[PDB]
């Protein structure tokens, strides 16, 4: 599923991402935009053989199991295919554990390079 800007903002707000660990809702929407273009089925292969999955491009190296990343961890305890669902529940729950491990949202390269230090509030402007 390809989410709308305000549609995803409402969904994320309901799952308790607004102000989670000090990060306003605008940051999460901005991250989703430049990681997957609001597409839940987005996948990308990394050089080391791992793969990013879903709306927030979560790495199979540490967080999920896809069965083809030798010597990797499954810290979110889910198959990576569950992150491609039209229901973002799995992706949100896993992202909460990632943002809490010390590095914050710096774990997402696109947020660090294209969202950090900008007016992220603009991403939720106009939404009910």
| Residue from 7, 18, 35, 48 carrying the catalytic annotation | 35
Nearest-Å Rg of the Cα atoms of the chain is 14
Please check if 87 is assigned to a binding site.
no
Residue corresponding to tokens 């961890």:
73
Domain ranges of the chain: 1-128
How is residue 29 written in tokens? 């929407």
Residue 35 annotated as catalytic: yes
Give ∠ CA 65-9-121 in degrees, rounded to 5.
Answer: 115
CA nearest neighbour of 5 among 23, 24, 32: 32
Structure determined via: X-ray
Classify residue 2 by burial, with Cβ atoms within 10 Å: 0-12, 13-18, 19+. middle
Query: What is the CATH architecture of 1-128?
Result: Orthogonal Bundle (1.10)
Residue 7 annotated as catalytic: no
**Resolution limit, Å:** 2.2
How is residue 73 written in tokens? 């961890």
Measured CA to CA, the distance from residue 43 to residue 24 in angstroms comes to 26
| Residue from 7, 18, 52, 87 carrying the catalytic annotation | 52
DSSP designation for 79: B
Number of Cβ within a 10 Å radius of residue 119: 10
């Amino acid at each position: 599923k390809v989410f709308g800007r305000c549609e995803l903002a409402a969904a994320m707000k309901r799952h308790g991402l607004d102000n989670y660990r000090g990060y306003s809702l605008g940051n999460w929407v901005c991250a989703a935009k430049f990681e997957s273009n609001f597409n839940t089925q987005a996948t990308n292969r990394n050089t080391d053989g791992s793969t990013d999955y879903g709306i927030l491009q979560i790495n199979s190296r540490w967080w999920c199991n896809d069965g083809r990343t030798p010597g990797s961890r499954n810290l979110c305890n889910i198959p990576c295919s569950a992150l491609l669902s039209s229901d973002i529940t799995a992706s949100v729950n896993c992202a909460k554990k990632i943002v809490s491990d010390g590095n914050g949202m710096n774990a997402w390269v696109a947020w660090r390079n294209r969202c950090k230090g900008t007016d992220v509030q603009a991403w939720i402007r106009g939404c009910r």
